Amino acid sequence: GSIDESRIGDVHKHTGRNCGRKFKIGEPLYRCHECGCDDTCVLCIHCFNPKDHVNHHVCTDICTEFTSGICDCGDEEAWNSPLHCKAEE
Ligand SMILES: [Zn+2]
Ligand SMILES: [Zn+2]
Ligand SMILES: [Zn+2]
């Protein structure tokens, strides 16, 4: 077999558990009007999968110092539809 060590690999994969990545200032936060339960359900850049949200109203935000957030990818009580983590691609 042959793997390339330079690749991002699987450092962002979180199969079976929630992502819970903490947003640092400047990073994008993704929210979907159709998929998210309340206006606090968010996805990180590594998780957000455009495929899941074709025809949906996606809202992007820049993370600030006042942003206290962790990624909700894989927490099934935060989403109306099952998501497909991008890190799995
Ligand atoms: Zn995430
Ligand atoms: Zn994910
Ligand atoms: Zn969506």
Swiss-Prot record:
Zn(2+) 1 binds at residues 14, 47, 73, 85. Disulfide bonds: none annotated. Zn(2+) 3 binds at residues 32, 35, 53, 56. It comes from the Eukaryota. Zn(2+) 2 binds at residues 19, 44, 47, 71. Zn(2+) 4 binds at residue 57. A zinc finger (UBR-type) spans 17-89. Ubiquitin ligase protein which is a component of the N-end rule pathway. Recognizes and binds to proteins bearing specific N-terminal residues that are destabilizing according to the N-end rule, leading to their ubiquitination and subsequent degradation. Recognizes both type-1 and type-2 N-degrons, containing positively charged amino acids (Arg, Lys and His) and bulky and hydrophobic amino acids, respectively. Interacts with UBC2. Interacts with RPN2, RPT1 and RPT6 from the 26S proteasome. Belongs to the E3 ubiquitin-protein ligase UBR1-like family. This is E3 ubiquitin-protein ligase UBR1. The chain holds residues 107 to 193 of 1950 of the full protein.
